[PDB]
């Protein structure tokens, strides 16, 4: 399973596969790993499936209230919420979340949280378990500050490699684009990158 | 001996204490008028700024609860922040455990119970505030539910509050008696706000400025308050009336 | 996993004199084949003419020594600046040890 | 916080608890409500009233469903009715339905609601409930059955009864119109008619709420295909239906 | 245990087997396996037999509460989010794997929920031991936009794949078809395969064959008074 | 403050006497008669209802006879609401004793237990007492039939024939006068209706104000059967004793 | 070993037309040693019959548990509990102790007084209601019982055809099982009349 | 009718007023005067601190305590009780900073303390507060300033005062926004914070005082709450002496 | 009326009367005078016995090896606070390796007194302590009110007839601060000070109790023959 997020000039573009294997039998193959936790701050889930979803519901409860009392959260804020649930039940709740989002004041930001629960800011992130095959590809051909067209190909091309080398990554490539223009979903079916 | 000082029944079967809560929802002296459009719901309130030093932006009586449900408060501002706070906390809590956004119907019932529970324990003071909840439901259409210090609520075509509210209620009454329909007809929400301001200019016997108004509108799936610049624009459209 | 006790070595030798006492110990401080420090005491003064050394595993050594120097302080405070005997110091130390008997202390303590 | 842990329901010197009597006072201020138990149904009727005509009474429930066989109707305080309907629903499911797999008999649910009344005379810091309920219902073992729960905390089974501000007039009219055999169509014809000598405002189907616990419906059950289950015997009548039958008085 | 839940254009159809097992031995040739949270929220359950029946009965309880406290229809999500939350606390010590299906005012739905609190959404899901087999048939015949008369056949042949090839599955095939703003129809015992032959003889016995040591009559009645 | 508003229901008066206890017995005289007569073959329990009406169902009202367990029933005098709480506590307390010792609870034990709960509230917690008084009709193998009255204070004393509730004085003296120890249940029935005829607060002793129940040794197989009579059997026996 | 095979025990139950019958063995062992040939595993609350298999002590605990619950049912609602209503209470009591449960396997057998239908039901450890209108078998010779019972049984039997079938079914598994047998009691439950018939059978 | 309505505070008198809470306002009047000028840049607090005797130590005692690292809280009324309201928000802010990892907004803080002071008016087991606080600071939403009545009511402000000299302070701030219609920097506003305290020491001209001035400004201290001290302060004092002569 | 037996109720004159009554607990206690400089602080206390056979009541309580409190109120109430100061002194040493600051120790003290004046059934502590101590900021003398208000002073007094001591110190204020490195004189200026609070009570070797704290002296209490060179 491969999850990623990349920062670019107009904001941040998120990227996921859709295969969730358990064992040898693929339970679901159209999984939507890209979750809205506010309305301009979306996340990416990887790892132990029930334990990531449980946390996400609680983070959603935290941010819906945060909005209603104190004002709109930031990428920073949301990631922090996430960390402190993984950190304080860090023996039994096993979660890798990439919190990506578009602020109207600081633009796109990416945070990566691995399984211990430590935040780290990054200009693109990769976490998962199918992202150990594309580590060297993602760093060499990535550029900070790419225009829009470029970004969408960068994340496609990586996931295409992830699909190829990792059999726990597959199906549709889902991308959610977070920008000031708004919130736009793109979907790329297999022939469209298996062509390359 | 004592029964006007706690929350036990009097010989007459009445709760004098509960009766004082309805005479303590008028100390603000602010009038509000809330009407249901076709697809929109509008609430207009007075807003006063007593001094120079105070900033009007912060002075408010329209508090945003859900993201679709606002609440317009008459009566004292401590009991208003506490009532806002609980109502807001519940709204979040409902989303968490049933996975959709709260029906207004249910928050009106929910707060009715908590209101009641404060008249049902002796220590706990009940909250002297009339809350008017404005929404546009996705199953139940445009609605207004008004709670009051007893822990009663009922739905409304339209409603008014404040001390001078007798005058206002009658104006409202005439419009729907004459028409014979339960809601204002017009699809553009801009004009339901317009209708509303006129009915308040006639009822209270006054014209207004942008600072004397604070206007909240719930459309579908969102609640906002209009800025004071935008409110001047609503006031020009009454010369076109 | 976790392992909750180590050892930090060193040695003590308490010799009760006939009208004096001597309490010696090496100050070598180690962990595994590493020498942590050349010099770092394992004999602490507690005052009121009682010396104390807990040698063994360092982390307990520091805490049980520490909890003794408060039991000295509180004794002076509430029994009103009576002398604290070696004999009364001992009995007291036994409860400090025994208080934890299920996650126990790890030091041999000589006063 | 709390710092009350002593009752405020206390005996008077000549006997009788002062508080349970006062609470019963607040009930006879309220609306007039009646229930008539027939051989094939129970009909209940109450009158709906609002702050103002701009208040709707179609979004207010003065008749509630507790279980699909046992309904409620009140005279007394609106607020007290609200909480006491919800706590009954919660105890109907939690203290019998889970365990015994079916919904409680009418008697058995009545018995349970009577202990809630009791703990608001007893226990510190509380005052009694200020409603008298009729709880009409149907169970398989008592047939159709009518009870009247009061703030005292005692219940009495009835054949037909009235509570509210018109209670004394109502029961004198009900004495002469209860018959041994009453059909469900006849029962509705007495209950609207009694309530009509206790109305002085508007008389329309939008101001008179009527609900039957007649005989069963396999059309409000929501499914078909299990013949064990037979739907709601409770069936609240909309304003229009009640209105046809007002023109047929 | 083969349980399909197939979404279609105007609704959802969910069908299951009638076999309940206890170890390798077939407890019951016919038993219900489709249970009813709410009259518009059906569910079938796979995994551990007691914990299917009780967890349905229990979130069943709280939704019925909740639907009447809100004076509105009980939504598919309402059920889903309580199930989910409840199962996570015991950290996957309660063995249930339910296909949850239903219609509500805000459309047709179909969910699956694992014993911890993963939830997935397709337009066709299956859980059980039959899951594998069921799923194969669906992916060949299935398309987007199926009619009712289409849907039911797809549901039936799907469970029959389950019966032939899975051994935890057998006997009759139950269906429940739900369409939006029409009554939910329970067609228990829709399609019966494996109808039991006539036994070769009767194994009835004349009177007196077995030996009694003693007899008595023992009382089930209350004490009477003459 | 909260100290202000405290009633103080658990204090001694200057006389040495508990206000709430004296008042509890006072208010039980408003509530209907209850009579118990102990024969030497059973116990007759007969009680006159505190309210009657012409619209009221009089055929499933229970406000006087209630079964605590299989072989122990009460007659009730006080408010019924109060009695209902203690009645489910007694039913539990009995049913527990059977559970652990596999023998049905003695009458002595079950009656001292009820008195102790009642005593408790006047003793501690600042809570009103329950204004209830029970006459217990009950059987055990240990002394056969036992008749007992407990009061809201929480003390029990045995009786041969006793009355609590409305016109207490009138019923008790009359009972002493007609008492013999040679009565059997036929006779015991007759005297219990006859004493109620003298205390009656209405026109005549009518079926629709009576609850009536017995515990009989004439019942089959040498074992007590508790018979709570229907109003159609009360109406039959009311002709038998010749009152009507 | 097994917590439900350390004293053995079996219960068989069958329906007929207008009648049910239930039956248990009378063996209480402690492992290999036989202690008693006269311990019941059937009990009766009212006209319902609840046969309980599995670990020795939990048969007895559970009997006094339902003894408690049946008393409170009867007292409040003023009738003897029906078979169908009771089955739901047998399920819930097991499930309350979901973890570390009662290591039993009861059998509910009755004839409803409100409809006149034979009605039977079963339970495992955790308790899943097992509907039938055939027969339900439970215990440590249950693998044998499931085969044996099905083979003789013809759908619907007369009240005294039913005594010959359920008696043979019980005998033949019980003398091919080591922890079952050793004297047995068979009940025939008609509308209003229950006869308890002990059986002559192999003690060795 | 009846007797009372002042023995408890979860009574309501019939008029629609409270008691005790209505009486608690007189308690805040016994305090000293304390001002806040909300500047464009930040806020500038100042407080009259009485010097009774020369027995006390000058510039060693404070009514300006920091809450968080960027919020002055400065109070009048009954001083231990006012310090308990400051104590409470140090706890509150530290939890928020743990939970959400950002400096606690001023508008968030304003809600939080408000709920607590309201909270004591809803039981009879605790006493209503008999202090008013004037608090504000600089967070990232701009400079903000608040006054919180013991009633549990707070509002926006751009100038506040409380205590004995609240009549002269309220009026002299009216003059201060009407001198300057486009506003003034915090560096100048130190000098007015001194002037109107000295004018509100004519209500306390039986006493002598030491002046404490403090600021939180975006660009004079980088948004951080500090004390004004040294050479800048002695200049504020000189301006104020000339102004009252 | 009932505003005076309830610690939770105001008071139409804007007070609470209980804290006020509690402030009168200090007036009926005995007299003590504190004076401090930049290197040494001193407490000079007048102990007061009941009758001829009774002992004299200790009025300087050792709080630490560099901190001392002295009561002037009621003795039983002072025993709750003395522990509290000790507890927060050992916690500060234990956790943060810090000999607990004197000024911060006042601020803890406030909030313990406040929380019982807010609460019903509670009371303000009737004792009022003068608290000396030597930290890195030098010597300090705190006066603790029953109010929970703490103030920092060059020298003050509380007790009975306290006003006369405040006068002796208001005059002699500018003498003793410029005394530094001479504890002998600092002790001598307080003996004269507490002598103005007498009324033929005199000072003997059983009446006088002095305790000092230094930059070169720990906490010490002098009594018996050790205050007999300072009569």
What element of type H or E holds B34? strand B32-36
Cβ contacts of A135 within 8 Å, gap of 6 or more: A126
What are the CB-based long-range contacts (under 8 Å, 24+) for D190-195?
D190/D36, D191/D34, D191/D35, D191/D36, D191/D43, D191/D44, D191/D45, D192/D45, D192/D242, D192/D245, D192/D246, D192/D249, D193/D249, D194/D34, D194/D36, D194/D45, D194/D162, D194/D170, D195/D32, D195/D34, D195/D45, D195/D46, D195/D47
G66, G69, G88, G129: which to substitute to probe chain D, counting the most D Cβ within 10 Å? G88
Length of chain H: 245
CA-based nearest residue to A138, from A114, A154, A122, A153: A154
Give the chain D residue whose CA is nearest to the CA of B34.
D54
CA-based nearest residue to I41, from I219, I175, I207: I219
Q: SS3 for E141?
A: helix
Domain boundaries, chain G: 1-204
Establish if F6 touches chain H: CB-CB under 8 angstroms: no
Distance, in Å, from the CA atom of H146 to the CA atom of E37, rounded to the nearest integer, reads: 52
- Kindly list the residues from chain B whose CB atom is less than 8 angstroms away from the CB atom of residue E85: 97
Q: What backbone torsions phi and psi does residue I4 show, to the nearest 5 degrees?
A: -115, 5
Q: SS3 for D65?
A: strand
Resolution of the experimentally solved model in angstroms: 4.1
Establish if D227 touches chain G: CB-CB under 8 angstroms: no
Inter-residue contact F1 to F109 (CB < 8 Å): no
Q: Is the dihedral of CA B138, B100, B134, B110 positive or negative?
A: positive
Q: SS3 for C104?
A: coil
Q: What backbone torsions phi and psi does residue A71 show, to the nearest 5 degrees?
A: 100, 165
Q: SS3 for B71?
A: strand
Distance, in Å, from the CA atom of E95 to the CA atom of E48, rounded to the nearest integer, reads: 5
Inter-residue contact B41 to B133 (CB < 8 Å): no
Whether A1 sits among the annotated catalytic residues: the reply is yes
User: How do beta strands A25-28 and A20-22 pair?
Assistant: antiparallel
What is the C-alpha radius of gyration for chain H, rounded to an integer number of angstroms?
Answer: 18
For the record, the structure tokens of D153 come out as 């905390």
Distance, in Å, from the CA atom of G86 to the CA atom of G93, rounded to the nearest integer, reads: 11
Inter-residue contact D21 to D150 (CB < 8 Å): no
Bridge partners (DSSP) listed for residue F48: F210
CA neighbours within 13 Å on the CB side: how many for F129? 34
- Solved how? cryo-EM
Q: Is the dihedral of CA E27, E29, E30, E35 positive or negative?
A: positive
Establish if B1 touches chain F: CB-CB under 8 angstroms: no
Cβ contacts of F222 within 8 Å, gap of 6 or more: none
DSSP E51-87: HHHHHHHHHHHHHHHHHHHHTSPPPHHHHHHHHHHHH
Q: Is the dihedral of CA D117, D122, D124, D130 positive or negative?
A: positive
CA dist list (Å): G182 to E211, G29, G31, G162: 15, 10, 14, 22
Q: Do I9 and F1 touch (CB under 8 A)?
A: yes
Q: SS3 for G195?
A: strand
Inter-residue contact B213 to B47 (CB < 8 Å): yes
Residue with tokens 């810091």: D125
Please list the active-site residues of E: 1
Q: Which domain holds residue A118?
A: 1-196
Cβ contacts of E87 within 8 Å, gap of 6 or more: E55, E94, E96, E113, E115, E116, E117
CA-based nearest residue to G70, from D106, F70, F141, F66: F70
Longest dimension (CA), chain C: 51
CA dist list (Å): B67 to B33, B139, B223: 21, 16, 6
Inter-residue contact D85 to D77 (CB < 8 Å): no
G:83-122 residues touching chain D, CB 8 A cutoff:
85, 87-89, 91-92, 114
Q: Which chains touch I (3 or more CB pairs under 8 A)?
A: C, F, H
Distance, in Å, from the CA atom of G2 to the CA atom of G144, rounded to the nearest integer, reads: 18
For the record, the structure tokens of E106 come out as 């805000």
Q: SS3 for I4?
A: coil
Q: SS3 for D182?
A: coil
DSSP chain A: -EEEEEE-SSSEEEEE---EEETTEEEESS---EEESSSSEEEEEEESHHHHHHHHHHHHHHHHHHHHHH----HHHHHHHHHHHHHSSTTT--EEEEEEEEETTTEEEEEEE-SS---EEESEEEEESSSSSSHHHHHHH--SS--HHHHHHHHHHHHHHHHHH-TTS-S-EEEEEE-SS-EEEEEE-THHHH--
- Discontinuities in chain I with C to N beyond 2.5 Å fall right after none
Establish if D2 touches chain H: CB-CB under 8 angstroms: yes
CA torsion angle G38 G44 G48 G53 (round to 10) = -40
What is the C-alpha radius of gyration for chain G, rounded to an integer number of angstroms?
Answer: 16
Cβ contacts of E88 within 8 Å, gap of 6 or more: A50, A54, E116, E117
Interface of I with C (CB under 8 A): 62, 86, 90, 94
Inter-residue contact B187 to B39 (CB < 8 Å): yes
* Domain F1-244 = CATH 3.60.20.10: yes
Please tell me which of the candidates H57, H61, H81 has its beta carbon nearest to residue I154: H57
C:38-77 residues touching chain I, CB 8 A cutoff:
66, 70, 73, 77
Cβ contacts of D104 within 8 Å, gap of 6 or more: D67, D70, D92, D96, D97, D112, D139
Q: SS3 for D139?
A: strand
Please tell me which of the candidates E40, E57, E68 has its beta carbon nearest to residue D222: E40
Q: Is B49 exposed, middle or buried (0-12, 13-18, 19+ CB in 10 A)?
A: middle
CA-based nearest residue to A189, from A176, A177, A172, A174: A172
Establish if I119 touches chain H: CB-CB under 8 angstroms: yes
CA dist list (Å): G177 to C95, E213, G83, G125, G174: 61, 22, 31, 21, 5
Inter-residue contact F165 to F24 (CB < 8 Å): no
User: How do beta strands G107-111 and C34-37 pair?
Assistant: unpaired
Q: What backbone torsions phi and psi does residue C104 show, to the nearest 5 degrees?
A: -80, 165
Inter-residue contact I131 to I67 (CB < 8 Å): yes
Distance, in Å, from the CA atom of E206 to the CA atom of G195, rounded to the nearest integer, reads: 20
What is the C-alpha radius of gyration for chain D, rounded to an integer number of angstroms?
Answer: 19
Residue with tokens 């009025």: I59
Q: What is the DSSP letter of E181?
A: T
Distance, in Å, from the CA atom of F152 to the CA atom of F133, rounded to the nearest integer, reads: 6
Give the chain F residue whose CA is nearest to the CA of I3.
F1
Q: Is the dihedral of CA G53, G58, G64, G68 positive or negative?
A: negative
Which CATH code of 1.10.150.120, 3.60.20.10, 3.40.50.620, 1.10.645.10 fits the domain covering D1-249?
Answer: 3.60.20.10
Helix, strand, coil shares of chain E as percentages rounded to 5?
30, 35, 35
Bridge partners (DSSP) listed for residue A109: A101
Q: What is the DSSP letter of F9?
A: -
**Nearest chain F CA: its distance from B11 CA (Å):** 18
First to last CA, chain E: 58
> D47 in the Ramachandran plot: left (φ > 0), alpha (ψ -120 to 50) or beta?
beta
Inter-residue contact B167 to B204 (CB < 8 Å): yes
**Nearest chain E CA: its distance from F228 CA (Å):** 12
Q: Which chains touch D (3 or more CB pairs under 8 A)?
A: B, E, F, G, H
What element of type H or E holds D47? strand D42-47
For the record, the structure tokens of C88 come out as 């009364």
For the record, the structure tokens of F181 come out as 């120890």
What element of type H or E holds B191? helix B190-204
CA dist list (Å): D229 to D223, D224, H148: 10, 9, 62
Distance, in Å, from the CA atom of I111 to the CA atom of I127, rounded to the nearest integer, reads: 15
The CA-based angle I140-I145-I147, given to 5 degrees, is: 135
CA dist list (Å): D230 to D138, D217, D222, D223: 13, 7, 10, 10
Q: SS3 for B45?
A: strand
Longest dimension (CA), chain A: 50
Distance, in Å, from the CA atom of H36 to the CA atom of H43, rounded to the nearest integer, reads: 7
Q: What is the CATH number of the domain that holds A136?
A: 3.60.20.10
**Nearest chain B CA: its distance from F128 CA (Å):** 16
CA dist list (Å): C72 to B80, C66, C76, C93, G98: 57, 10, 7, 11, 54
Q: Is the dihedral of CA D122, D125, D130, D131 positive or negative?
A: negative
Length of chain E: 226
Cβ contacts of B80 within 8 Å, gap of 6 or more: B61, B63, B73, B129
Residue with tokens 């006492």: C21
CA torsion angle H57 H60 H64 H65 (round to 10) = -130
Inter-residue contact B139 to D21 (CB < 8 Å): no
- Kindly list the residues from chain I whose CB atom is less than 8 angstroms away from the CB atom of residue F3: 6, 120-121
Q: What backbone torsions phi and psi does residue A41 show, to the nearest 5 degrees?
A: -140, 110
How many Cβ pairs closer than 8 A exist between chain D and E? Answer: 38
Number of continuous H segments (helices) and E segments (strands) in chain F: 6, 10
- Kindly list the residues from chain E whose CB atom is less than 8 angstroms away from the CB atom of residue G47: 220
DSSP chain H: --S-SSS-SSS--TTS--SSHHHHHHHHTTS--EEEEE-SSEEEEEEEEEE-SSSBPTTS--SEEEETTTEEEEEEESHHHHHHHHHHHHHHHHHHHHHH-SPPPHHHHHHHHHHHHHHTTS-SSBPPP-EEEEEEEEETTEEEEEEE-TTS-EEE-SEEEESTTHHHHHHHHHHHHHH-SS---HHHHHHHHHHHHHGGGSSSTTSEEEEEEEEEETTTSSS--EE--HHHHHHHHHHHHHHH-
Cβ atoms < 10 Å from Cβ of G36: 14
Residue with tokens 């301009």: A40
Q: How many domains does chain A have?
A: 1
Cα A166 to chain centroid distance, Å, stands at 18
Domain G1-204 fold is 3.60.20
- Discontinuities in chain C with C to N beyond 2.5 Å fall right after none
CA-based nearest residue to H169, from H34, H27, H5: H34
Q: SS3 for E2?
A: strand
Please tell me which of the candidates B20, B55, B78 has its beta carbon nearest to residue H158: B55
Q: Do B123 and F2 touch (CB under 8 A)?
A: yes
Q: List the catalytic residue out of H3, H32, H121, H221.
A: H32
């Amino acid at each position: 399973t491969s999850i990623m997020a990349v920062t670019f000039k107009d904001g941040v573009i998120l990227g996921a596969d859709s295969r969730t294997t358990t064992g040898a039998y693929i339970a679901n193959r159209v999984t939507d790993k890209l979750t809205r936790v506010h309305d301009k701050i979306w996340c990416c889930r990887s790892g132990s499936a029930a334990d990531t979803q449980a946390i996400a519901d609680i983070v959603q409860y935290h941010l819906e209230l945060y909005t209603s009392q104190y004002g709109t959260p930031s990428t920073e804020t949301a990631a922090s919420v996430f960390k402190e649930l993984c950190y304080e039940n860090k023996d039994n709740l096993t979660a890798g979340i990439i919190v990506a989002g578009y602020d109207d004041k600081n633009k796109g930001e990416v945070y990566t949280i691995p399984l211990g629960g430590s935040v780290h800011k990054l200009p693109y992130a990769i976490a998962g378990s199918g992202s150990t095959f594309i580590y060297g590809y993602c760093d060499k051909n990535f550029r900070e500050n790419m225009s829009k067209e470029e970004t969408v190909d960068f994340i496609k091309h990586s996931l295409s490699q992830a699909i190829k080398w990792d059999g726990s990554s597959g199906g549709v490539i889902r991308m959610v684009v977070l920008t000031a223009a708004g919130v736009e979903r793109l979907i790329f079916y297999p022939d469209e990158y298996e062509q390359l | 001996g004592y029964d006007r000082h706690i929350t036990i029944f009097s010989p007459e079967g009445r709760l004098y204490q509960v009766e004082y809560a309805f005479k303590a929802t008028n100390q603000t002296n602010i009038n509000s008028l809330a009407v249901r459009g076709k697809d929109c719901t509008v609430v207009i309130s007075q807003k006063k700024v007593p001094d120079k030093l105070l900033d009007p932006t912060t002075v408010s009586y329209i508090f945003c609860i859900s993201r679709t449900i606002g609440m317009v408060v008459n009566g004292p501002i401590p009991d208003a922040r506490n009532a806002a706070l609980r109502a807001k906390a519940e709204a979040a809590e409902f989303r968490y455990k049933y996975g959709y956004d709260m029906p207004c119907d249910v928050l009106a019932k929910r707060m009715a119970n908590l209101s009641q529970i404060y008249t049902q324990r002796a220590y706990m003071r009940p909250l002297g505030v009339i809350l008017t909840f404005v929404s546009v439901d996705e199953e139940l259409g445009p609605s207004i539910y008004k709670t009051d210090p007893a822990g009663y609520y009922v739905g409304y075509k339209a409603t008014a509050t404040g001390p001078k509210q007798q005058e206002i209620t009658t104006n409202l009454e005439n419009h729907f008696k004459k028409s014979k329909i339960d809601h204002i007809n017009e699809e553009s929400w801009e004009k339901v706000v317009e209708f509303a301001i006129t009915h308040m200019i006639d009822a209270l016997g006054t014209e207004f400025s942008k600072n004397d108004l604070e206007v909240g509108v719930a459309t579908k799936d969102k609640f906002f308050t209009l800025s004071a610049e935008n409110i001047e624009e609503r006031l020009v459209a009454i010369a076109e009336q | 996993q976790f392992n909750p006790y180590g050892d930090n070595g060193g040695t003590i030798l308490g010799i009760a004199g006939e009208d004096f006492a001597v309490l010696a110990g090496d100050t070598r401080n180690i962990t595994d084949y590493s020498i942590n420090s050349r010099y770092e005491p394992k004999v602490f003064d507690c005052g009121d003419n009682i010396v104390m050394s807990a040698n063994g595993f360092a982390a307990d050594g520091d805490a049980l020594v520490k909890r003794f120097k408060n039991s000295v302080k509180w004794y002076h405070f509430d029994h009103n600046d009576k002398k604290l005997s070696i004999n009364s110091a001992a009995r007291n130390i036994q409860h400090l040890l025994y208080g934890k008997r299920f996650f126990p202390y790890y030091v041999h303590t000589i006063i | 916080t709390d710092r009350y842990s002593f009752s405020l329901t206390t005996f008077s010197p000549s006997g009788k608890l002062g508080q349970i009597d006062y609470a019963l006072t607040a009930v006879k201020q309220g609306v007039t409500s009646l229930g008539i138990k027939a051989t094939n149904g129970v009909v209940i009727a109450t009158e709906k009233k609002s702050s103002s005509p701009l208040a709707m009474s179609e979004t207010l429930s003065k008749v509630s469903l507790l279980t699909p066989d046992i309904g409620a109707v009140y005279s007394g305080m609106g607020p007290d009715y609200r909480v006491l309907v919800d706590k009954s629903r919660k105890v109907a499911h939690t203290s019998y339905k889970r365990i015994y797999g079916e919904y409680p008999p009418t008697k058995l649910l009545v018995s349970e609601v009577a202990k809630i009344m009791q703990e608001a005379t007893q226990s510190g810091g509380v005052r009694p409930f200020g409603v008298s309920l009729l709880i009409a219902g149907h169970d398989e073992f008592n047939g159709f059955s009518l009870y009247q729960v009061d703030p005292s905390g005692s219940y009495f089974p009835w054949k037909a009864t009235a509570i509210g501000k018109g209670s004394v007039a109502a029961k004198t009219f009900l004495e002469k119109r209860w018959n041994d055999e009453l059909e469900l169509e006849d029962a509705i014809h007495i209950a609207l008619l009694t309530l009509k000598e206790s109305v002085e405002g508007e008389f329309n189907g939008d101001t008179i709420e009527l609900a039957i616990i007649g005989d069963e419906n396999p059309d409000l059950l929501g499914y078909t295909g299990i013949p064990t289950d037979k739907g709601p015997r409770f069936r609240k009548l909309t304003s229009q239906e009640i209105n046809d039958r007002l023109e047929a008085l | 245990t083969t349980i399909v839940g197939v979404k279609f254009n105007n609704g959802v159809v969910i069908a299951a087997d009638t076999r309940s097992t206890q170890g390798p031995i077939v407890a019951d040739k016919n038993c219900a396996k489709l249970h009813r949270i709410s009259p518009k929220i059906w569910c079938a359950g796979a995994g551990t037999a007691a914990d299917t029946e009780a967890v349905t009965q229990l979130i069943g309880s709280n939704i019925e509460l909740h639907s009447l406290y809100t004076s509105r229809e009980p939504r598919v999500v309402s059920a889903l989010q309580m199930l989910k939350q409840h199962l996570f606390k015991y950290q996957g010590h309660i063995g249930a794997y339910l296909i949850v299906a239903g219609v509500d005012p805000t459309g047709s739905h179909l969910f699956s929920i694992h014993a911890h609190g993963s939830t997935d959404v397709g337009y066709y899901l299956s859980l059980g031991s039959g899951s594998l087999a069921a799923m194969a048939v669906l992916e060949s015949h299935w398309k987007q936009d199926l009619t009712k008369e289409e849907a039911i056949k797809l549901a039936s042949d799907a469970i029959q794949a389950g019966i032939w090839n899975d051994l935890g599955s057998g006997s009759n095939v139950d269906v429940c078809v739900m369409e939006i703003g029409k009554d939910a129809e329970y067609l228990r015992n829709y399609l019966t395969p494996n109808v039991r032959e006539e036994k070769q003889k009767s194994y009835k016995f004349p009177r007196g064959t077995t030996a009694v040591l003693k007899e008595s009559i023992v009382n089930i009645c209350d004490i009477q008074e003459e | 403050g909260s100290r202000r508003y405290d009633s103080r229901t658990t204090i001694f008066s200057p006389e040495g006497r508990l206000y709430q206890v004296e008042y509890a017995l006072e208010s039980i005289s408003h509530a209907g008669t209850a009579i118990g007569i102990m024969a030497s073959d059973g116990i007759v329990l007969a009680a006159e209802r505190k309210v009657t009406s012409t619209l009221l169902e009089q055929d499933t009202s229970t406000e006087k006879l209630y079964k605590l367990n299989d072989k122990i029933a009460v007659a009730v005098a006080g408010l019924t609401a109060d009695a209902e709480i203690l009645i489910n506590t007694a039913r539990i307390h009995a049913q527990n004793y059977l559970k652990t010792y596999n023998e049905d609870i003695p009458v002595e034990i079950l009656v001292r237990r009820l008195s102790d709960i009642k005593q408790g509230y006047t003793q501690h917690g600042g809570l009103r007492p329950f204004g209830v008084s029970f006459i217990y009709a009950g059987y055990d193998d240990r002394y056969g039939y036992q008749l007992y009255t407990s009061n809201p204070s929480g003390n029990y004393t045995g009786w041969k024939a006793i009355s609590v509730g409305a016109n207490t004085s009138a019923a008790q003296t009359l009972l002493q006068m007609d008492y013999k120890d040679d009565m059997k249940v036929d006779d015991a029935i007759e005297l219990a209706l006859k004493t109620l005829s003298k205390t009656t607060d209405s026109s005549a002793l009518t079926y629709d104000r009576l609850e009536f129940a017995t515990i009989r040794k004439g019942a089959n197989d040498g074992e007590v059967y508790q018979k709570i009579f229907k109003p159609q059997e009360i109406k039959d026996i009311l002709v038998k004793t010749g009152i009507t | 070993s097994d917590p439900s095979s350390i004293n053995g025990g079996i219960v068989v139950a069958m329906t007929g037309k207008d009648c049910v019958a239930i039956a248990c063995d009378l063996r209480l062992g402690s492992q290999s040693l036989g202690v008693s040939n006269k311990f019941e595993k059937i009990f009766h609350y009212g006209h319902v019959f609840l046969g309980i298999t599995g670990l020795a002590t939990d048969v007895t605990t559970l009997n006094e548990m339902f003894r408690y619950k049946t008393n409170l049912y009867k007292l409040k609602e003023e009738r003897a509990i029906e078979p169908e209503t009771f089955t739901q209470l047998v399920s819930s009591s097991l499930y309350e102790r979901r973890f570390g449960p009662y290591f039993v396997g009861p059998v509910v057998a009755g004839i409803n007084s409100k409809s006149g239908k034979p009605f039977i039901a079963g339970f495992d450890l955790i308790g899943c209601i097992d509907e039938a209108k055939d027969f339900i078998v439970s215990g440590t010779a249950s693998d044998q019982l499931f085969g044996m019972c099905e083979s003789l049984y013809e759908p619907n039997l007369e009240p005294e055809d039913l005594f010959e079938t359920i008696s043979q079914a019980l005998l033949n598994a019980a003398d091919r099982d080591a922890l079952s047998g050793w004297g047995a009691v068979v009940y025939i439950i008609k509308k209003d009349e229950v006869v308890k018939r002990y059986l002559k059978m192999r003690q060795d | 009718i009846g007797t009372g309505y002042d023995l408890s505070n979860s009574v309501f008198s019939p008029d629609g007023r409270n008691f005790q809470v209505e009486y608690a306002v007189k308690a805040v009047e016994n305090g000293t005067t304390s001002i806040g000028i909300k500047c464009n840049d930040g806020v500038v607090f100042a407080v009259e601190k009485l010097i009774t005797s020369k027995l006390l130590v000058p510039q060693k005692n404070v009514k300006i305590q920091v809450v968080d690292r960027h919020i002055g809280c400065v109070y009048s009324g009954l001083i231990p009780d006012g310090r308990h309201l400051v104590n409470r928000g140090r706890e509150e802010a530290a939890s928020f900073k743990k939970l959400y990892k950002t400096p606690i907004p001023i508008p968030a803080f304003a809600d939080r303390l408000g709920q607590y002071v309201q909270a004591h008016t809803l039981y009879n087991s605790v006493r209503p507060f008999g202090v008013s606080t004037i608090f504000g600071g600089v967070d990232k939403n701009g400079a903000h300033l608040y006054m919180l009545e013991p009633s549990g009511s707070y509002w926006g402000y751009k100038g506040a005062a409380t205590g004995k000299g609240r009549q002269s302070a309220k009026a002299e701030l009216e003059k201060l926004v009407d001198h300057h219609p486009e506003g003034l920097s915090a560096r100048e506003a130190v000098k007015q914070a001194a002037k109107i305290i000295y004018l509100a020491h004519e209500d306390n001209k039986e006493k002598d005082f030491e002046l404490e001035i403090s600021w939180c400004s975006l660009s004079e201290t980088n948004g951080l709450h500090k004390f004004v001290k040294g050479d800048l302060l002695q200049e504020a004092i000189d301006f104020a002496q000339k102004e009252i002569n | 009326n009932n505003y005076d037996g309830d610690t939770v109720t105001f008071s139409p004159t804007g007070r609470l009367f209980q804290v006020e009554y509690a402030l009168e607990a200090i007036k009926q206690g005995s007299v003590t005078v504190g004076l401090r400089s930049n290197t040494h602080a001193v407490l000079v206390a007048l102990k007061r016995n009941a009758d001829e056979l009774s002992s004299y009541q200790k009025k300087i309580i050792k709080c630490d090896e560099h901190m001392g409190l002295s009561l002037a109120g009621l003795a039983p109430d002072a025993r709750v606070l003395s522990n509290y100061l000790r507890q927060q002194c050992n916690y500060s040493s234990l956790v943060f390796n810090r000999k607990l600051a004197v000024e911060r120790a006042g601020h803890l003290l406030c909030d313990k007194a406040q929380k019982n004046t807010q609460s019903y059934g509670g009371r303000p502590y009737g004792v009022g302590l003068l608290i000396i101590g030597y930290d890195k900021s030098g010597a300090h003398l705190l006066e603790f009110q029953p109010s929970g208000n703490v103030t920092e002073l060059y020298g003050t007094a509380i007790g009975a007839r306290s006003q006369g001591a405040k006068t002796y110190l208001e005059r002699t204020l500018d003498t003793f601060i410029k005394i530094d490195g001479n504890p002998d004189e600092l002790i001598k200026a307080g003996v004269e000070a507490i002598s103005q609070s007498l009324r033929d009570e005199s000072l003997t070797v059983d009446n006088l109790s002095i305790a000092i704290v230094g930059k070169d002296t720990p906490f010490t209490i002098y009594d018996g023959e050790a205050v007999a060179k300072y009569i």
